[PDB]
Design a protein around this ligand. Structure first.
Ligand SMILES: CC(=O)N[C@@H]1[C@@H](O)[C@H](O)[C@@H](CO)O[C@H]1O
Ligand SMILES: [Ca+2]
Ligand SMILES: [Ca+2]
Ligand SMILES: [Ca+2]
Ligand SMILES: [Ca+2]
Lengths: 57, 298, 4, 288
């Protein structure tokens, strides 16, 4: 029925946003009292990004 | 087809928990930003026109100093590197940890931004440099005082390093869009500023030379592209200010990607907008350390 | 001090 | 085979993203400014700290001054009291954080750090002291204040204080000792049996000496021996640019050369007792 597999488009938007937010939070270390210690899991994003294209073949 | 509502259900439920985490992260940092970070940079007695005069006056330690290039100019703070090569280096640009936003407009790049220096351990003076851009008015004034040389140094995430030394360096004033000129190259990083990207050839390499270029920020387009569409701009939103051509072989003022390696699908506008020196590492590697230092040429 |  | 779309999870995520991007933009505007520096310089300026006080400045702290004959303005610590006296402070010892074994150029130009709180060690620089104290027809005074390791303080005042030009090796001069319970170490001290020790340890009219520029009255090198820059004779009775010793007490065994090289003022404490704090500061004599 509904072949809206554009979750690969939302996955791309989240990857950019994760990175963009990582950069922006980091740029607060030179402005604010405390800097939030955090990471970005590009591995988790790409493992399930390897899928979708897998289940749609 | 039958096994399609399994992973496609878990992928979206993964993303919604990722939005909750990001939502929380951004919110927590916002609370930290209720109050600022602080320094107490007590001022060295020794002063001069810039960092070279200061080292000639016996200021031999790398730290923040007050300099007054001209009696018409208000005295201002700078980090002096007194240890690299022969010392006497006025730091005009420094990156080391991504603690400062370099995606800024014309006026911030005009005035200067970021942290000149911070306190080390329990010392009453600021001996460590912060991330900053000195400011185009100040950089122009310093380079135009007499013949000035430029040292650009960078370091990757494995601890390897290279340098680009330009024996001659000048930056014109605001009326002249802060136009850059460099010559007398030597070093290990590759002559990105004069020769363009080493991986490109012909027209495509030529359009990456920074020498002779005007300064542009994302709200003030002075790049090499003369087309009348907002889509063709070297500096886009949250992009660094730099001497862009069409567009770059190098951008010390780019976005700070952690770990060095990054890709088009991590970049806000899909471009190579990182702390880049193509002639060393390519367009998709972002330096761990990057800095720019000037000194009167002798 | 002094120097004798 | 099942037929359930749900998909509100997808559209609810897009809306959650658009709202998150709004929050991210708001955080960006909160991370534009640099760290706030507690150290600020005052706006009022003048020929010296007294001129600055006369113009209505009430707070001790950092100020630019420019004596008439100075080519450029320079930063100083001003001490301003409740009576409108503005002292220009040219030397401070407090904790041993700054090395005072410095050369001619360094003593000429100044070293150490200036703080609004007056909690840092420094030497202002001989050229500057000369400029401030030799302004045309303005008699100056020097106050030396000392603190021991038991919280007691004492002072010594010198009238018509002047530091000469580099051409006269920044010679220390004053007309007379103007009093104070620290006593007059600049008049030298009668340490022992030698009939000439007091004469050879006085400081009035002494040229300035560093290790690399010896202008003292000794066959050897007082400044090099005692690790300092000072108006050495042969060698000293007051020595405020000496080695910082924690606890005050030190001995010959403490030193490489065997001589008293601490922060001494022989008329107040034995030369083997080193001050906790010192201040050398100048003001127009008429303020006293
Ligand atoms: C012939 C050649 O070198 N191809 C380049 C191409 O790589 C580049 O993408 C394009 C846009 O600038 O310009 C062309 O000249
Ligand atoms: Ca920005
Ligand atoms: Ca353009
Ligand atoms: Ca005697
Ligand atoms: Ca001698």
């Amino acid at each position: 029925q509904l072949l809206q597999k554009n979750v690969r488009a939302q996955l791309v938007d989240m990857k950019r946003l994760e990175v963009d937010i990582d950069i922006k939070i980091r740029s607060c270390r030179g402005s604010c009292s405390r800097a939030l210690a955090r990471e970005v899991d590009l591995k988790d994003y790409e493992d399930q990004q390897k899928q979708l294209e897998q289940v749609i073949a | 087809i039958p096994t399609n509502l399994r992973v496609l259900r878990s992928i979206l439920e993964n993303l919604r928990s990722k939005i909750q985490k990001l939502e929380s992260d951004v919110s927590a940092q916002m609370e930290y930003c209720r109050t600022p970070c602080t320094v107490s940079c007590n001022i060295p007695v020794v002063s001069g026109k810039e960092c070279e005069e200061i080292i000639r006056k016996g200021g031999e330690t790398s730290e923040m100093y007050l300099i007054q290039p001209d009696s018409s100019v208000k005295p201002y703070r700078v980090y002096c590197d007194m240890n690299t090569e022969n010392g006497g280096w006025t730091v005009i640009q420094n990156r080391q940890d991504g603690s400062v936003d370099f995606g800024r407009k014309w006026d911030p790049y005009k005035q200067g931004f970021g942290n000149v220096a911070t306190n080390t351990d329990g010392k009453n003076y600021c001996g460590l440099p912060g991330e900053y851009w000195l400011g185009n008015d100040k950089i122009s004034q310093l380079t135009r005082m007499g013949p000035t040389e430029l040292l650009i140094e960078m370091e990757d995430w494995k601890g390897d390093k290279v340098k680009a030394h330009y024996g001659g360096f000048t930056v014109q004033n605001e009326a002249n869009k802060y136009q850059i000129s460099v010559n007398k190259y030597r070093g290990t990083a590759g002559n990105a500023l004069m020769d363009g990207a080493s991986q490109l050839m012909g027209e495509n390499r030529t359009m990456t030379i920074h020498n002779g270029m005007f300064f542009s920020t994302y709200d003030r387009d002075n790049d090499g592209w003369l087309t009348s569409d907002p889509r063709k701009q070297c500096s886009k939103e949250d992009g660094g200010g730099w001497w862009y051509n069409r567009c770059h072989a190098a951008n010390p003022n780019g976005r700070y990607y952690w770990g060095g390696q990054y890709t088009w699908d991590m970049a806000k506008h899909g471009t190579a907008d990182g702390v880049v020196w193509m002639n060393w590492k390519g367009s998709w590697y972002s330096m761990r350390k990057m800095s720019m230092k000037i000194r009167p040429f002798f | 001090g002094h120097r004798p | 085979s099942s037929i359930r779309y749900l998909q509100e999870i997808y559209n609810s995520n897009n809306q959650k993203i658009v709202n998150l991007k709004e929050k991210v933009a708001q955080l960006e505007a909160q991370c534009q400014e640099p760290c706030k520096d507690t150290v600020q310089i005052h706006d009022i300026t003048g020929k010296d700290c007294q001129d600055i006080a006369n113009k209505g400045a009430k707070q001790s702290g950092l100020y630019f001054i420019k004596p008439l004959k100075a080519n450029q303005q320079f930063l100083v610590y001003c001490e301003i009291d409740g009576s409108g006296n503005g002292w220009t402070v040219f030397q401070k010892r407090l904790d041993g954080s700054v090395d005072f074994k410095k050369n001619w150029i360094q003593y000429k130009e100044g070293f150490g750090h200036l703080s609004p709180t007056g909690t840092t060690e420094f030497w202002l620089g001989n050229e500057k002291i000369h400029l401030i104290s030799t302004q045309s027809a303005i008699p100056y005074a020097l106050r030396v204040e000392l603190e021991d390791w038991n919280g007691r303080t004492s002072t010594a005042d010198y009238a018509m204080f002047k530091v000469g030009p580099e051409a006269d090796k920044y010679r220390l001069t004053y007309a007379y000792f103007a009093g104070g319970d620290a006593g007059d170490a600049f008049d030298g001290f009668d340490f022992g049996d030698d009939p000439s020790d007091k004469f050879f340890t006085s400081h009035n009219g002494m040229q300035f000496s560093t290790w690399d520029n010896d202008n003292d009255k000794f066959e050897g090198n007082c400044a090099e021996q005692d690790g300092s820059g000072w108006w050495m004779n042969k060698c000293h009775a007051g020595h405020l640019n000496g080695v910082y010793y924690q606890g005050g007490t030190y001995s010959k065994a403490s030193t490489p050369n065997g001589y008293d090289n601490g922060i001494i003022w022989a008329t107040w404490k034995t030369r083997w007792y080193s001050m906790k704090k010192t201040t050398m500061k100048i003001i127009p004599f008429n303020r006293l």
